Design a protein around this nucleic acid. Structure first.
Lengths: 176, 37, 130, 141
RNA sequence: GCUGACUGGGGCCUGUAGAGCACUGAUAGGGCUAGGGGGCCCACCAGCCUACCAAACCCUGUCAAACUCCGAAGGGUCCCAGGUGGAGCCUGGGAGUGAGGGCGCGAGCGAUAACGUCCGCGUCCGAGCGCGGGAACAACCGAGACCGCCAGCUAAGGCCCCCAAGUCUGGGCUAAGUGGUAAAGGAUGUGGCGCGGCGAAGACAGCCAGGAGGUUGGCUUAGAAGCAGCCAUCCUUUAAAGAGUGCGUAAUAGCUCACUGGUCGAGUGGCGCCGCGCCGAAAAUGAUCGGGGCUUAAGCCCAGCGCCGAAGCUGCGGGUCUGG
RNA sequence: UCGCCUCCUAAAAGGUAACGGAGGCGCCCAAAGGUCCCCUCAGGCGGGACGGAAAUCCGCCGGAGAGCGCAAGGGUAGAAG
RNA sequence: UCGAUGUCGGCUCGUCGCAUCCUGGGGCUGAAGAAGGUCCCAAGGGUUGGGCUGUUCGCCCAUUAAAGCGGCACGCGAGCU
């Protein structure tokens, strides 16, 4: 789970992209210095960690910096990333979205059964050092009626996260 | 099926071969003889 | 390259698991001389002295990994592999000596053996047969 | 059919189709999906037009979303009537759609299907379109 | 008598493109719950709760000429500067002109039709049908023609011929006369990229060989051998084999098959990008890219040197009108 | 249809078109005017005999969504109410 | 184009065009033969007489292989009615 970024100096952003590289920016309370990486080298990674794991960098500086996207400007049209951003990880608890993965087979399936996963990630605070990956859900009792949400889930020791707790996390609607 | 502006594969034994300067399609049952037009 | 390590690695725990392993070559054999060459080599054995028409390219390694040789003379074509695990190696090699000499097969359609760890020849498939 | 229930003006000057999309560009819901490439007006009828075909290809299957919405009033003058003399009344509705505009998206529908679906689903539509799943659609963190 | 157009910097006016839902509305799906029918139940009617319609609440998603918490680029205006030009200010005598057009861009009408039409910015024709280029052609590109020369260099557009000037030099694609002008939508047409699947423990092509057992299970208002139809959803004799993609039968027998021994013994199949070309593709005297003709082009794409070519500009001479 | 007021159109100054898109005016008020002194909403959620789903009450949270003769719009409780 | 480009129909005389009505050809087919059905190639030559209506067109009668669709100022008035 590692990337090498090339120090952006401040040379036509258009260039980079219209080059073969993929510009970006890393930072945090202390820092904020324009950077860049290659397009491709990127995706392979993304498509795997995207933003639920932690990307470590190196740069020409043999400096490995632990991070994870705060966002990614996209392209509106002909979709394909534009800019990128990197949050230089500290030891201080931080706002990251835990990847969600529901387990078991839906009750209302034999019967009407088409599961809606509202938001399968989440605004969880925690020491970046200790970041569980996926969070165990359930369906061994999920019906077409309302459906589990908020804090009816497991909070791995150390995880406190910010929800409401309200946001219906998921549910099942009727087929066709 | 024979002459249409949308030639495709209808079944599995169909082969898209081209010739004379047009896409063609042959198969087991003539019931597929396709020919761009 | 997945089950190739599931099949070739399943070809030596039974290669290093015997005391009467042959591997002739069988050609022109119907669907009645095969369930008759093992229905006749498992009554004086049970579920151990099977009729294995194994692999030839999977024998230049299904034999050279647990570390061996003197094998570059016994399966250069469609070769089998008669591995005997239970019952004295004298009822599956006699019940193997008359299962190619009982339907009009020439007594030269086998390729030696490795019956207990000491190479084998062409006058020994007839020797440990009578 | 499909249209508001209310309006602040019945008749509305048509306008133009410039670049961008301003919105919707990502997933946010389904398991796979379609995306407009060319800009245009998509008529309600055309919307359900597919809508149906969809649910069709998959009898009692997955759950659909038609992230778009017509609500501009399509204007037509009377057959033959000539120029000037006031604006034709309504005829139907549309939904301006700037490229990269996701339109719908299935879910829980074996890809093979979700896809196949979103293929015909588009055949009703008057412009090319694109099939996708979930990628860089993650605006969480 | 230096204010003018235009330009810089200063200080502000403002609500368009966009984008966003905070106000006015439109919104697809979710969750939520003031409520009510209803039941346990007697009662000033407490409470428990509903495999029902739903106010609103927020969530997730977007929409807007007449919505804006938000707001550019621009434009305007005023101050200080630059700016000597057929710039301005001012007074007085005369005008003609008040049908407009085309093209680009911003918008209404129209059907995101029309050498249409109406308004804004700019251009041009008008009156620049004088020239060049554009096949011919007021308005598309060049460019502002006082007059002469048997002078020179370029602009646009060109460089094989008709017809002035490279059958010029490099490196790529094209195989249809595409170029020499129509779409959706289709396809093992080529050219350059991509990711996976697997092989010298000899894969896909190649051909002689095996395709077994439980076996043909049941629910039946005819019957289920893989071989109409559903649930359970694996074990046996194995080199390899299910209750088998099917040619092939009514249940079958079988030609054969996923799975495989292997003689063969080197790379090989199904999918995402871009260039570029094909089908789609029918109209009315006689054809056609202006024409003849073009195929490592006389095309197309990226380079490089160089000319041809105006009435524009120089050289030269003459005519002329304001200023000094 | 013909004069007039408001909004958009109208391309951030002004204005700017159509037999363009959408509403009004041809009145009123001796207090609805001068002025000086006083006072504060709309809603939402509880709480309340008649009581819708807003009457008039009581208690909180609520700066403007109420009102201002009338169309829309500008504006406005630090008052125009 | 109004200091004039004669305005339906017919008669006559034609020419053209394929999107083909015959006739020649082909493949499919739910094609056995026959007969058709639908699609392609293809105008070389054919594409009738009458009743009514000014009618073009229709609607009928009798045949036909077949009785096709259009353009030519919805051809054709210095050719005619």
């Amino acid at each position: 789970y590692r990337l090498k970024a090339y120090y952006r100096e401040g040379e036509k952003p258009s260039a980079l992209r219209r080059a073969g590289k993929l510009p970006g920016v890393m930072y945090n309370r202390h820092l904020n210095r324009k950077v860049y990486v290659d397009l491709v080298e990127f995706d392979k990674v993304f498509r795997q960690a995207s933003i639920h794991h932690v990307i470590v960098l190196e740069l020409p500086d043999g400096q490995s910096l632990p991070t994870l996207v705060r966002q990614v400007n996209l392209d509106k049209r002909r979709r394909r990333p534009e800019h990128v951003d990197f949050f230089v990880l500290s030891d201080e608890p931080v706002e990251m979205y835990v990847p969600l993965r529901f387990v078991g087979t839906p009750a209302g399936v034999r019967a009407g059964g088409v599961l809606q996963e509202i938001h399968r990630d989440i605004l969880v605070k925690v020491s970046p050092r200790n970041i569980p990956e996926f969070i165990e859900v359930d369906v061994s009792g999920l019906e077409i009626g309302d459906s589990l949400h908020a804090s009816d889930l497991k909070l791995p020791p150390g995880v406190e996260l910010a929800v409401s707790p309200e946001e219906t996390i998921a549910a099942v609607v009727p087929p066709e | 099926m024979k002459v249409r502006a949308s030639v495709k594969r209808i079944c599995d034994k169909c082969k898209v071969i081209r010739r004379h300067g047009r896409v063609y399609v042959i198969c087991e049952n003539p019931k597929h003889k396709q020919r761009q037009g | 390259x997945x089950x190739x390590x599931x099949x070739x690695x399943x070809x030596x725990x039974x290669x290093x698991x015997x005391x009467x392993x042959x591997x002739x070559x069988x050609x022109x054999x119907x669907x009645x001389x095969x369930x008759x060459x093992x229905x006749x080599x498992x009554x004086x054995x049970x579920x151990x002295x099977x009729x294995x028409x194994x692999x030839x390219x999977x024998x230049x390694x299904x034999x050279x990994x647990x570390x061996x040789x003197x094998x570059x003379x016994x399966x250069x074509x469609x070769x089998x592999x008669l591995x005997x695990x239970x019952x004295x190696x004298x009822x599956x090699x006699x019940x193997x000596x008359x299962x190619x000499x009982x339907x009009x097969x020439x007594x030269x359609x086998x390729x030696x053996x490795x019956x207990x760890x000491x190479x084998x020849x062409x006058x020994x498939x007839x020797x440990x047969x009578x | 059919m499909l249209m508001p229930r209310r309006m602040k003006y019945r008749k509305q000057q048509r306008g133009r189709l410039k670049g961008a999309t301003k919105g919707g560009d990502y997933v946010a819901f389904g398991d796979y999906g379609l995306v407009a490439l060319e800009p245009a007006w998509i008529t309600a009828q055309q919307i359900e037009a597919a809508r149906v075909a969809m649910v069709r290809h998959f009898r009692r299957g997955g759950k659909i979303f038609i992230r778009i919405f017509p609500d501009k009033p399509y204007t037509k003058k009377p057959l033959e009537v000539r120029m000037g003399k006031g604006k034709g009344n309504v005829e139907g509705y549309v939904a301006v759609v700037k490229p990269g505009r996701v339109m719908f998206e299935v879910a829980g529908v074996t890809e093979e299907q979700a896809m196949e679906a979103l293929r015909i689903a588009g055949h009703k539509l008057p412009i090319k379109t694109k099939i996708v799943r979930r990628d860089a659609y993650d605006e969480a963190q």
